[PDB]
Amino acid sequence: XXXXXXXXXXXXXXXXXXXXXXXXXXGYSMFAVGIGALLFGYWSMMKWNRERRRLQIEDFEARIALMPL
Amino acid sequence: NFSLRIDELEEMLTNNRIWRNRTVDIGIVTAEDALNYGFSGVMLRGSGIQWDLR
């Protein structure tokens, strides 16, 4: 009996298949989150600066109140 | 396992902005003067003439 190297292909490994595809981001939907984070960013920040004004006037009031200084 | 391994490079190098910035438009030679150098593999095969030895 002769024994040589046997042939096997099975699945053929798929000859040239695309793996690159669009994922997560679509296009217009990313701008809704992108610019949406900006509008949420300013509104949250400016409310803190209005709360800073409560401290600001109260800080300068200490100088006016102190005349024996 | 090879088909996924080679396709890992395409999602790494070809899709990126860097390669579309760097390698794009360097020595665009495809004319009869490009044929007057004789590269056989790639170059002429890579761009222009549909000739191949295979």
SSE diagram, text form:
The structure is cut from a larger assembly and holds chains A (69 residues) and B (54 residues).
Chain A: H1 28-65
Chain B: H1 2-14, H2 17-22, H3 32-35
PDB class: oxidoreductase
Keywords: NADH:ubiquinone oxidoreductase, multienzyme complexes, Complex I, mitochondria, oxidoreductase
Entry title: Structure of mammalian respiratory Complex I, class3.
Description:
The structure is cut from a larger assembly and holds chains A (69 residues) and B (54 residues). The N and C termini of chain A lie far apart (114 Å). Chain A is mainly alpha-helical and 69 residues long. The longest helix of chain A is centred in the C-terminal third of the chain and has 38 residues, at 28-65. Helix content of chain A is 55%, strand content 0%. In chain B, 43% of the residues lie in helices and 0% in strands. Chain B has helices at residues 2-14, 17-22, 32-35. Chain B starts with a helix and ends in a 19-residue tail after the last helix. The A-B interface holds A 13-14, 17-20 and B 2-4, 7-8, 10-11, 15.
